[PDB]
Design a protein around this ligand. Structure first.
Ligand SMILES: Cc1cc2nc3c(=O)[nH]c(=O)nc-3n(C[C@H](O)[C@H](O)[C@H](O)COP(=O)(O)OP(=O)(O)OC[C@H]3O[C@@H](n4cnc5c(N)ncnc54)[C@H](O)[C@@H]3O)c2cc1C
Ligand SMILES: Cc1cc2nc3c(=O)[nH]c(=O)nc-3n(C[C@H](O)[C@H](O)[C@H](O)COP(=O)(O)OP(=O)(O)OC[C@H]3O[C@@H](n4cnc5c(N)ncnc54)[C@H](O)[C@@H]3O)c2cc1C
Ligand SMILES: Cc1cc2nc3c(=O)[nH]c(=O)nc-3n(C[C@H](O)[C@H](O)[C@H](O)COP(=O)(O)OP(=O)(O)OC[C@H]3O[C@@H](n4cnc5c(N)ncnc54)[C@H](O)[C@@H]3O)c2cc1C
Ligand SMILES: COC(=O)c1ccccc1S(=O)(=O)NC(=O)Nc1nc(C)cc(C)n1
Ligand SMILES: COC(=O)c1ccccc1S(=O)(=O)NC(=O)Nc1nc(C)cc(C)n1
Ligand SMILES: COC(=O)c1ccccc1S(=O)(=O)NC(=O)Nc1nc(C)cc(C)n1
Ligand SMILES: [Mg+2]
Ligand SMILES: [Mg+2]
Ligand SMILES: [Mg+2]
Lengths: 582, 582, 582
């Protein structure tokens, strides 16, 4: 089926074998930045006709772009870097992909094998450095292993709990000629023996039993449900259970639905956190009970039976002890429970109307809100407008901070893989590169990077990439001249004592600095600024309608605070529902 | 002597103790970027009146700035970052400082101790990740240890072979109140017992003996002599031995001297490599026999007695076996040998005229050269002009690549700590941030970042820092629209097959992309472009004369090749003396 | 040349491949103790007709036996153990072989690959546990790798600085059928590129030059000269330089020679340490400047030029900085220097008579001595008698402690590999098992284990092995009822305050306990006790003349102290020349 480019008997460079290994894996896009130790790989790349390379302007841009690609497609993201500084520049991206369980394969060039450990030119023990921040990694010591290792890396990166896998390839092995064997079996006995088996009916039935026995059930959906959109939807219509979501889970279930409690956690809706606080049954599907969501574990869902379905046994009972657990694919568990619910429908007659109403009162007494001052643009409102003009069908990538929280709160994601945000590590500068990868993976989609002025500038150099690659990336920059999230904490806990959180120029306190429009101009990307709420709708519309890349610099008052807010390690009773930096 | 800010009996936050620990170390500048896990530290920082913080726009910018500070002052560079992504963003900087032996202390915030290892919000096992890329690191587990650890870190970072030391500080320890004990003794028994003792006279005399017994002596000076400028100078005038230098050693001995053979190695002068190839005595002072300099070890200084003086015993005999070694401070060894040479002067009567002439013929037959095409600006010439107009008294930081090599070849450094360049790791994007640190450390000096278009854009966001901090940083951008060094290798070894090395826009092949002038404009930094060699001198003069930050975009023909060049693992007989990409 | 036992096309069990891998390496003897995880290997072993297995009674016995085999033959020692407790029981042996640089290959069975890391029955992470105590180790993950790994292990264990290498073999791989490929190339690029090249003449000549320039030269020979007996002898007759030896070097040069200064160090002869203290030239051949020999480094050979020839660059300049070093095989360096010395003989006319005499006076004023009390047997005397009756042609293995020191002091080894003693780790219980291995490796030699009552009892179970294997092992047990070496230190530094150092029974203080004769009897080994010095000579003679295994229990007064003695970290001026525990 697969048509190679070399005679089955003809030897080729290890680099060429590495590339075919990728083509055989179905790879079409890679984000690679050339360097000495990886020249061979880049040369082999130009010989390929099925793989396109998107040359970033910084290796970190490459990884984040690969993450965006993966997060938006469900496919693994592939980035390539040279040795030493090339490799080290991927570090934040690997840690990010590992904490968020993003399928990713990173390939780094290395100095020749005999040069390893000798403090050679541009060498860093990347395998040692990245061991604790990757799902697994390798150091190829023989051209003969390229096929097997590449296959193993992709398998590991995509199976079970997705994650990053780094493959270190010495330069001498890239140049070595050999005849590849694509038949080699993978050496993953332990891992493959540990892969969860499909859920047992006895287990799934005890859950449906608990559901029928409950009066206040609540779904706690997370990043693990990204591929179970349909299964989850069907499940909710057969049980009528309200759905609360983590930041990683946004989109698994449409935020624009009466059964939707939206996001829970530190900055979750009052009603979402309320439902969990007063639920008797908590269905934790594809979540990892993070401190951001639980606060004080003792108080979290303190009065309810917890069911936890996860693909990683290491997560079940890590922070919260379930009453019922299922180690396996949530997508399968849902399909199974759906059948049962579908059959015993009549004898079940599930009705959680009273619960939903008890919640709908909370959803009405404590809905998400934002104040509007004069003609100042409310960031929340801008996002709300973006949602409207894009009909909630846009892929949104973001930076980290207040804007990120608002992008999560005030936009309704119809489906998963529409929300691309760094949640676990919370790395700034993720938004722009992520958008690049998402756009390449989704050429027809509307890709909007809702960024912050602090996050945007960190990888601003990727604007060059966007232009040269001609990607229709739209940038909705919520410029507030500060490191918002941190200044909010300065206001709440440090008597508003500013400590290096102002990003503008002290010499011209009232001048917007820097002038993001000029960064755009430098890379030939049309841009415009907005300051009055009145002409914001027209502005955003322009950005959307203008073909190609576009930067809309939206000026916002910095005293805005993300609400509501449950302080760290707090309880639902510590939730802050009002205030700002005024 | 030291006046604190807290009553000796009054307890203060661990964060405040950490800051005083810095003040007590003599720290005046730190490059810190605020984050959740480090808020306390930033707050404590604002209470300090002796320490100023330079807020970068990216943690990588912070480290590189700290490196520039250190490299240009001889003082340790201090950078601070928050946990998770903050910490991971320092990685390339730590690896860089370790490979180049740059004194640096990095402080990173961490999640609360009880949260460690739980996959907490923004946590990364930074100590584990950085163990192989730092001289040493710590995880503070008790506020009581702040004083001792900080003292130990600075001691380790600055003593012996300088290097980076990272201190991980959990957030709960930053908030804990305590009364510091500044009297605690350091726990470095092993290290301190291993510190080299001053050189023995017997050893130093055997060297002076070898010198008198030689006919073709050659000094091989490196980064280890940065603090022995005077001792080295005196030594050379007492022996009259020609001085070859590594890229790290530039400036230890004035490049503008008849006894100077300039740089040796891969891109070293033909005469410098010649002298080493035909020397009978090689005086390796403060060097680590890197592959860049030696090529094929067997052939390197194959016909001569090698004397190696290093402060790190692990380096003596690592790649080349000396005939005589001295493990200690080269500065002391020079002072000792100077006395001997000064006394036995008459009975010695050292005269290496014949050798120097044999070399001066090579220096004349094979001098550094560059061709000039029409009115196209020769990068070499631009640097030569910069040297002239600044009277070789400017501090030069650079990126990595061809421009870096030219900045090394065509500028005469009068003293050490004038040349700030990433040599071991060779990390791109180093030039601009390094200049920031150098300028802060040297407010009166002329600081010029000779960058490449590829390297410059990686950390272009630091332009905002330069403006806001009002630093007179001059940027001599040698724009060639490509990743020069890599394209040169494409030309020599890959039939000029371009593989992702073009940095401009393929849609407008002839248009300079991006427009670096606009990046400058965005951060309110005056800038101008130059294309004709005729008005280059006036341009550079303007840049220098214009008060404050300035960006001069110098357009160069990309077919330029750095010469001469000894291919990797090659011999002096493989030296390439001509050719380009035309 | 090699005749297998399976058709080149016929697949066999991995276990069978492992065994042929050994046969192909020239292995004839292995010391293996069967266990669950290694049954397959033992079965494959019985199919072999060239390899004999010596079943010990404890895995520790197996390793020590393998060490004895290696130490006495120059061949690598092979031991095999099962997983878990089998493997952990080898630990002391591996550490021992690593510290003494003894070529050894240890093979351990492991649980099936899929069971690894699951806390399986009898599984221990042996590769992780032994990483810091072996030269290198492996975990076989594919039957296909057996040939390559075994070849690599033997190569690594025997080349450069000899050491132990452990190969962990999962049980499922032992059972897997496959067709071995004995043509596979080893993957040791780094190591093989680092292997020292033969010494350069320039280097060797500078040494001969130093020798002619010296007046008080002293040879400091160690374990590295074990294979240079002849080269060393010739060297000494061409230079007439006195030879001092480390405990590991005994035998490299005949102790019974006027040019012999015998052992130096803590318990070295006064004259040996004197010569080093007052030498102007120290020729350190195959030594590692251990604290036992140097004491206070500053004072060690403080007034002399140090030449250090070692096969491990990591050792050159580790504790002492040489004035001249040579990283390579001492055997080759000697052959080279011998030629030079042989030619420039006349023009050299080396004469160190004055030095030798200055020493011969010391050798006469401070010779090794021992007092004789009534009819009590002096341990020193017993060993002296053993030497006489065996004509110094016996292979001597020992335990650790006073007897060990006396066995070193009062016996003249004619050749190397006659002295088998644990020097670096100094592990008790080594003597008996080591003798077993030595006897198997040297069926015709006289093998005598000079043991202590404390050391002997630790692995007394190996007596069963000696009997069943019918090995002519003689045991000269110097029974002093105490842990001698420790009690000596109690006397000198703790006011003779006994702290658990008495090995007899407090209930019968005057009764010899235990009765070692009965341990012998239990394993059917003839034994006899001696208490009177008068009938000691006849006793030892009997032991020697009685065919087969024999145990001679020699009772000695415990107040004996090993002398002379230079306290730890002391100087030659701190040498203790008299005293005991009376
Ligand atoms: C400024 C800031 C504020 C934040 N505030 C909030 C907040 O208020 N609320 C909030 O929710 N988050 C918040 N976060 C994000 C937060 O850090 C965590 O990233 C997020 O809560 C993790 O959610 P998750 O556990 O659902 O997803 P993940 O972290 O992606 O974990 C998914 C889990 O699902 C499992 N799983 C994966 N695939 C499958 C499958 N097929 N079948 C079954 N199980 C599977 C995994 O192995 C894992 O245990 C914030 C982050 C930042 C940067
Ligand atoms: C594109 C590129 C091309 C390059 N081309 C070249 C080239 O052609 N030529 C070249 O020289 N380099 C070149 N390099 C730089 C090169 O990689 C090495 O960084 C450089 O050769 C190292 O020189 P060094 O050993 O002298 O300094 P360092 O690497 O700084 O090593 C200094 C040494 O001195 C010792 N020492 C430190 N302090 C003291 C003291 N007080 N007393 C005694 N000893 C001390 C150290 O412990 C160490 O062993 C290039 C790099 C790049 C990025
Ligand atoms: C109770 C007790 C008391 C002790 N008292 C003393 C004492 O008083 N005096 C004493 O000497 N020891 C004493 N020791 C032994 C001591 O601990 C050390 O084991 C011994 O000094 C090590 O000697 P070595 O360095 O010569 O040999 P090794 O430790 O075997 O080291 C040999 C060295 O030679 C190098 N080498 C190996 N092969 C070659 C080759 N082919 N060419 C060149 N170089 C090579 C190695 O790599 C290494 O650096 C005592 C031990 C015990 C248990
Ligand atoms: C990182 O290099 C190594 O892998 C590396 C490290 C140590 C020794 C040899 C190599 S190498 O000989 O295999 N390749 C190169 O030296 N490449 C290279 N060098 C320069 C200077 C500029 C460019 C573009 N490529
Ligand atoms: C990285 O945080 C931790 O150290 C961390 C990690 C896990 C649990 C608790 C903490 S914490 O409670 O000690 N601090 C914060 O949670 N800080 C914080 N959080 C947000 C969301 C925005 C800002 C500015 N600061
Ligand atoms: C250590 O065992 C394992 O390797 C091991 C460890 C976990 C699971 C399976 C095995 S096994 O199934 O491959 N072999 C055995 O279980 N062997 C064994 N068991 C007993 C009880 C007594 C003897 C003699 N052999
Ligand atoms: Mg902001
Ligand atoms: Mg360029
Ligand atoms: Mg005893």
């Amino acid at each position: 089926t697969f048509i190679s480019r070399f005679a089955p008997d003809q030897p080729r460079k290890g680099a060429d074998i590495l590339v075919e290994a990728l083509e055989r894996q179905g790879v079409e896009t890679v984000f690679a930045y050339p360097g000495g130790a990886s020249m061979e790989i880049h040369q082999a790349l130009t010989r390929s006709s099925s793989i396109r390379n998107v040359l970033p302007r910084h290796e970190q841009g490459g990884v984040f772009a690969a993450e965006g690609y993966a997060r938006s497609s469900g496919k693994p993201g592939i980035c390539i870097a040279t040795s030493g500084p090339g490799a080290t520049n991927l570090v934040s991206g690997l840690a990010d992909a590992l904490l968020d369980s993003v399928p990713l394969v990173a390939i780094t060039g290395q100095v020749p094998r005999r040069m390893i450990g000798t403090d050679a030119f541009q060498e860093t023990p990347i395998v040692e450095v990245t061991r604790s921040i990757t799902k697994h990694n390798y150091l190829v010591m023989d051209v003969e292993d390229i096929p097997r290792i590449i296959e193993e890396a992709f398998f590991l990166a995509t199976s079970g709990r997705p994650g990053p896998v780094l493959v270190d390839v010495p330069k001498d092995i890239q140049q070595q000629l050999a005849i590849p064997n694509w038949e080699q079996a993978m050496r993953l006995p332990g891992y493959m023996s540990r892969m969860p088996k499909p859920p047992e009916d006895s287990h799934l039935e005890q859950i449906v039993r608990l559901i029928s026995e409950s009066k206040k059930p609540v779904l706690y959906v997370g990043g693990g449900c990204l591929n179970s959109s349909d299964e989850l939807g069907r499940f909710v219509e057969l049980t009528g259970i309200p759905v609360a979501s983590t930041l990683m889970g946004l989109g698994s279930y449409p935020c624009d639905d009466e059964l939707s409690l939206h996001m829970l956690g530190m900055h979750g809706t009052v009603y979402a956190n309320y439902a969990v606080e007063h639920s008797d049954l908590l269905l934790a599907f594809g979540v990892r009970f993070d401190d951001r969501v639980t606060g004080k574990l003792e108080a979290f869902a303190s009065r309810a039976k917890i069911v936890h379905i996860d693909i990683d046994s290491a997560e079940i009972g890590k922070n919260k002890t379930p009453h019922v657990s299922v180690c396996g694919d949530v997508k399968l568990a849902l399909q199974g429970m759906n059948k049962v619910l579908e059959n015993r429908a009549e004898e079940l007659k599930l009705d959680f109307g009273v619960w939903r109403n008890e919640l709908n009162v909370q959803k009405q007494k404590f809905p998400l809100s934002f104040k509007t001052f004069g003609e100042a643009i409310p960031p929340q409102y801008a996002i709300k407008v973006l949602d409207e003009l894009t009909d909630g069908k846009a892929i949104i990538s973001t930076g980290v901070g207040q804007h990120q929280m608002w992008a999560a709160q005030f936009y309704n994601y119809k489906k998963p893989r529409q929300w691309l945000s760094s949640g676990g590590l919370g790395a700034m500068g993720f938004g722009l590169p992520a958008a690049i990868g998402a756009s390449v993976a989704n050429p027809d989609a509307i890709v909007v990077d809702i960024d912050g002025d602090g996050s945007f500038i960190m990888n601003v150099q990727e604007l060059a990439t966007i232009r040269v690659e001609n990607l229709p990336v739209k940038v909705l920059l919520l410029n507030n001249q500060h490191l918002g999230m941190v200044m909010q904490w300065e206001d709440r806990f440090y008597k508003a004592n500013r400590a290096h959180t102002f990003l503008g120029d002290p010499a011209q306190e009232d001048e917007i600095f820097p002038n993001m429009l000029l960064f755009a101009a430098a890379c030939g990307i049309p841009a415009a600024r907005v300051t009055k709420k009145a002409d914001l709708r027209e502005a955003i519309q322009t950005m959307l309608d203008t073909p190609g890349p576009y930067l809309l610099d939206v000026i916002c008052p910095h005293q805005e605070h993300v609400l509501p807010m449950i302080p760290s390690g707090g309880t639902f009773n510590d939730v802050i529902t009002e205030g700002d930096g005024r």
